[PDB]
């Protein structure tokens, strides 16, 4: 009622400690730089990407930190228990990387409901979404045996669709026309560019960390690098195209510049060529800007799904472009493994995300977690001590 | 006394240029240069550099009108401290060969001073900070030399006590200064600094570990303790607040609580659950300190001093499992605390000198004392 | 026309795709690459965010210019190395592409606030050609060592940008502009780029250095040069201001001059004390340039440099080339002194000629250049928020 959030967090930490004590024991320095880049993407990249809101920077970065810090522990436990089939396991650098990937999926879902949820709801969403995400990625990697090294399907599409499903269940009628606080400021947009640029720079490590050392890891780095480079050009061009008087919009420049990194993930270690990554990146940037311009108003006003950060345009549509690219790549001989297995990976990702998101959102709707009122959405002052001076 | 700052156009340039000329001369007379893993060894020192300049530089930038001085003065102190620590650690451990490893050690020495300085920033000018840097590097080197002479330890491995030395030195220097706030954008910049400190703190828990296995275990332990401490800090910040809200300034410091708690024993901890227990204890102790220490000047520095003491205490408790060892370690800790307090008192006494042209107490925490701004009347 | 910029961006990206499909085929140096990458996108981009009403354009056009530049630089540098044949992409190709982006960002600093993104696209395309040809001339014909690229990146980029800015001279801006001012939080943001550049510069100067003694020397020499440069930049900033006040321009830029001036000599055995001497001189020269030489360039030579890149990249780059000549004279390296001098002269001359031609192309009233009243304002090209 007043002590709900500290109580739930301490209970969760005690549970994490018990699970580590029962199940967790102790290439590493080859992959540690890549893990560090992934870590910076998790905590600075997504953390400051969402600080564009003028009255929500504290909650954006701080709840990002809280969600991701709980998520790395819980994802370690869940992914390791899945890999070990219920027995004790030793953790190495790959366990940490995969746990940060799980936290990334939860943060993508967080970007959909940003400014409309409490930290308690975010703890609950972290715990449930890591379970759904980890079971889906186990199904994709071990049952389907598909190729998703950058996880366009198991991270980006899954997280974006799980978030939209929570956002639709948690939909508020008062917010459909808009909100006075759902607005950026100048220095808020500069902080959001901090997050954008760190994500953009370290994405090759994100897509290549789990790739096989040698040709596949190098291909993943090169493909991500050039896909992002092409994505920037198309995102700027179409942001000028769609907006009034041809003026750039910082929402597009902050988000659609990462669509090429999202859309190359499934094909990253595949031999698609530098030109192929650049074509995907160029399309992903165009699709992301067009989504922000046209799909987000349609989704908000007509479908009653409100996406605060437009994660559907950064992670959802570019994630489906990535899965679609991988099926086409298998068709063209870029990679082995079945075309149908890649298609099944895409379908399982999207479907399990929408099922799990709806059930998690049903748990979140309960009026027991201190969610803000319609008037107090996108406002740090509900949960934070806010300085008088900006 | 005039509240308007005295001109430093002759004091500060002469002081800094004389220091740099002396450094160049000493390096010329006493320093000398000198494979498969050069980049791997460089990465650890680069992480320490990032924590020193970005982390500690921005962590204290939270002040409403003192963010420029926090960031830039931290950069100046890092640049002076590393150069002086190279020479001092060469002298007290013997010419000085300059490797990547000695640069990494000197960065740790400078980070001691950067942590201490957060207790006094907003109340000192750059010349006072130069004096603080020089005296604190010399004092930490003397402490390490004395520990190596008495307890037969290694001078470079005595760099473990740097948490507790920095905490107590900073508090003792702050206590000697004359007696004397947030904004949203500086708070977000300080969050950036706090995040970089939090992310790279596993590196500072294992720059002194030679063996690969101890490094890997130390990094794991720091990682898991830091994650637990972050969750505990953000959750319990609401408990220790009259307004029942989360304090961003409290989070900026209490994120690092688990890393401070395990830092001295992260190689000894064999399983991650014990590191996570230590991180939980560190977070709860940070909450209790934030709720009690103000009642009985810097609250964050005081709770850091408590966390460093707890880290030493848990190192003592763990060292027995892996009676004379207890007494030697307690005597070493008391020696570190006594030397830190004594050199802090001496530094604060030297800082009160009128020749430094310190800011007036009515002018604390304002960049206007040190920086050019447009449209101001200058001089008389 | 409002469709000029999107059409140019799309056509340039399609040309990049075709060239990559025609000329390009498929881990120890990857961390150094990532440090250089951070210097390109966070360092320079936020370093230029000091202008109070131009932060969006500084950081965003930095991203856009560098993203175009790495692709075009990949093509141009790979073609020059391969003599027209297909080439493979390694970590070194990516590092060199980031370097080519750095040169254009340095030139962008000179014309910041007075140009449109379309102009920046054109400048990137032409400048990378001029830069890569000079770089090939220095590395292959002269065979002079410039491992930190004091001459080929910093001096080249600075004098190219000064030539462009001199061509694009606006008479109304010579006596100052209302928008050409910093803000308190804007300088706080600019310190982010300052700190990232300062922290990662040793990787910038050592990434392509020969592994072993040369790479270790480049790391250590760059580090101690930067350490000396910080102290001297602070001291001289206090020295040249009334009552010893620190100037944020000096602290943001002149603290980096040690990295620029040590670049030619970074892998030479100049010793830590020699690198410290070079960094100290660089810091002094940079502060003095910002204080006295920039007003002379703006008001008398009619060369308006927005970011003072002549004081960070130009003069310290020339100092670095001269230091390379002296170091060869002292026998620290085994190159030819005449070849080092030729490299410095060719860098400056090619930069000025190419900047002249490029600015003449940019001077055409086709690219949506702002009016004098609208210089240094984001609102010409961006949707600006109502609040700060
Ligand atoms: C991208 C995927 C597609 C599929 C899906 O996820 C995202 O889309 C979502 C979105 O479409 C959701 C719907 C949005 C509209 C919602 C309306 C809501 O009732 C409305 O509640 C409002 C206030 O709460 C009104 O007042 C009024 O009380 C009532 O009108 C109802 O309680 C749940 C609801 C119908 C939601 C059910 C679940 C969904 C269909 C979700 C579904 C899983
Ligand atoms: C790069 C620097 C150091 C040396 C080279 C400077 C050249 C490239 C530039 C800088 C000064 C420039 C001149 C400055 C001012 C004017 C007056 C204007 O009505 C026409 C262009 C003209 C005449 C410019 C032509 C180009 C110019 C000569
Ligand atoms: C503008 C330019 C000319 C000024 C910079 C040049 C001078 C001041 C610098 C750069 C080149 C330097 C020298 C280069 C190499 C060596 C060899 C080394 O074993 C001793 C130091 C010594 C001799 C350096 C001392 C300082 C030095 C002479």
Swiss-Prot record, chain A:
Cited Gene3D superfamilies: Ammonium transporter AmtB like domains
Membrane topology of the entry: Multi-pass membrane protein
Catalytic activity: methylamine(out) = methylamine(in); NH4(+)(in) = NH4(+)(out); CO2(out) = CO2(in)
Keyword terms of this UniProt record: Ammonia transport, Disease variant, Glycoprotein, Hereditary hemolytic anemia, Membrane, Transmembrane, Transmembrane helix, Transport
Organism, scientific name: Homo sapiens (Human)
Domain of life from the UniProt record: Eukaryota
Ranges in the topological domain labelled Extracellular: 82-94, 145-148, 211-220, 273-276, 335-343
Complex and partners: Homodimer. Heterotrimer; a RHCE monomer interacts with a RHAG homodimer. Component of the ankyrin-1 complex in the erythrocyte, composed of ANK1, RHCE, RHAG, SLC4A1, EPB42, GYPA, GYPB and AQP1. Interacts with GYPB (via the N-terminal); this interaction bridges the (RHAG)2(RHCE) heterotrimer with the SLC4A1 Band 3 I dimer complexed with GYPA.
GO cellular component: ankyrin-1 complex; membrane; plasma membrane
PTM summary: Glycosylated.
Implicated disorder: Regulator type Rh-null hemolytic anemia: Form of chronic hemolytic anemia in which the red blood cells have a stomatocytosis and spherocytosis morphology, an increased osmotic fragility, an altered ion transport system, and abnormal membrane phospholipid organization.
Sequence ranges on the Cytoplasmic membrane side: 1-2, 54-60, 116-123, 170-189, 242-249, 300-313, 365-390
Pfam families assigned: Ammonium_transp (PF00909)
Molecular function GO labels: ammonium channel activity; ankyrin binding; carbon dioxide transmembrane transporter activity; leak channel activity; methylammonium transmembrane transporter activity
Listed name of the protein: Ammonium transporter Rh type A
Tissue: Erythrocytes.
Positions of glycan attachment: 336
Swiss-Prot record, chain B:
Alphabetized Pfam families for the sequence: Ammonium_transp
Tissue: Restricted to tissues or cell lines expressing erythroid characters. Isoform 4g and isoform RhPI-Alpha are expressed in immature erythroblasts but not in mature erythroblasts.
Compartment list: Membrane
GO biological process, one term: ammonium homeostasis
Mutation effect (residue 62 to S): Found in antigen C/Rh2
Keyword tags: Blood group antigen, Membrane, Transmembrane, Transmembrane helix
InterPro entries (UniProt xref): Ammonium/urea_transptr, NH4_transpt_AmtB-like_dom, RhesusRHD
Residues spanning the membrane: 11-31, 38-58, 71-91, 115-135, 162-180, 184-204, 219-239, 246-266, 268-288, 303-322, 323-341
Stated role: Component of the ankyrin-1 complex, a multiprotein complex involved in the stability and shape of the erythrocyte membrane. Mediates the primary membrane attachment site for ANK1 when associated with RHAG. May participate in the ammonium and carbon dioxide transport through the heterotrimer form.
Subunit description: Heterotrimer; a RHCE monomer interacts with a RHAG homodimer. Component of the ankyrin-1 complex in the erythrocyte, composed of ANK1, RHCE, RHAG, SLC4A1, EPB42, GYPA, GYPB and AQP1. Interacts (via the N- and C-terminal) with ANK1 (via ANk 1-5 repeats); mediates the primary membrane attachment site for ANK1.
Linked pathology: Rh-null, amorph type: An autosomal recessive condition characterized by red blood cells that lack all Rh antigens, have increased osmotic fragility, diminished lifespan, and show changes in morphology resulting in stomatocytosis. Rh-null individuals have mild to moderate hemolytic anemia. They are at risk of having adverse reactions in response to transfusion or pregnancy, because they may produce antibodies against several of the Rh antigens.
The family this protein is said to belong to: Belongs to the ammonium transporter (TC 2.A.49) family. Rh subfamily.
Name of this protein: Blood group Rh(CE) polypeptide
Source organism: Homo sapiens (Human)
Curated annotation (Swiss-Prot), chain C:
Outcome of substituting residue 44 to S: In OHST; enhances monovalent cation leak; decreases ammonium fluxes; highly decreases STOM expression; decreases membrane expression; no effect on water permeability
Outcome following mutation: residue 85 to E: In Duclos or RHAG1 antigen (030001)
Gene Ontology MF annotations: ammonium channel activity; ankyrin binding; carbon dioxide transmembrane transporter activity; leak channel activity; methylammonium transmembrane transporter activity
Effect of mutating residue 40 to R: In OHST; strongly enhances monovalent cation leak
Pfam families membership: Ammonium_transp
Cytoplasmic compartment segments: 1-2, 52-58, 114-121, 168-187, 240-247, 298-311, 363-388
Modifications made to the protein after synthesis: Glycosylated.
UniProt entry keywords in alphabetical sequence: Ammonia transport, Disease variant, Glycoprotein, Hereditary hemolytic anemia, Membrane, Transmembrane, Transmembrane helix, Transport
Reaction(s) catalysed by this chain's protein: methylamine(out) = methylamine(in); NH4(+)(in) = NH4(+)(out); CO2(out) = CO2(in)
Topology, Extracellular side: 80-92, 143-146, 209-218, 271-274, 333-341
UniProt subcellular location: Membrane
Effect of residue 206 to L: In Ol(a) or RHAG2 antigen (030002)
GO biological process terms on file: ammonium homeostasis; ammonium transmembrane transport; bicarbonate transport; carbon dioxide transmembrane transport; carbon dioxide transport; erythrocyte development; inorganic cation transmembrane transport; intracellular monoatomic ion homeostasis
Tissue localization of expression: Erythrocytes.
Keyword NADP: no
The keyword Lipid metabolism belongs to this UniProt entry's keyword annotation: no
Disease in which the protein is involved: Regulator type Rh-null hemolytic anemia: Form of chronic hemolytic anemia in which the red blood cells have a stomatocytosis and spherocytosis morphology, an increased osmotic fragility, an altered ion transport system, and abnormal membrane phospholipid organization.
Similarity-based family: Belongs to the ammonium transporter (TC 2.A.49) family. Rh subfamily.
PANTHER family, alphabetized: AMMONIUM TRANSPORTER, AMMONIUM TRANSPORTER RH TYPE A
Record's protein name: Ammonium transporter Rh type A
Source organism of the structure: Homo sapiens
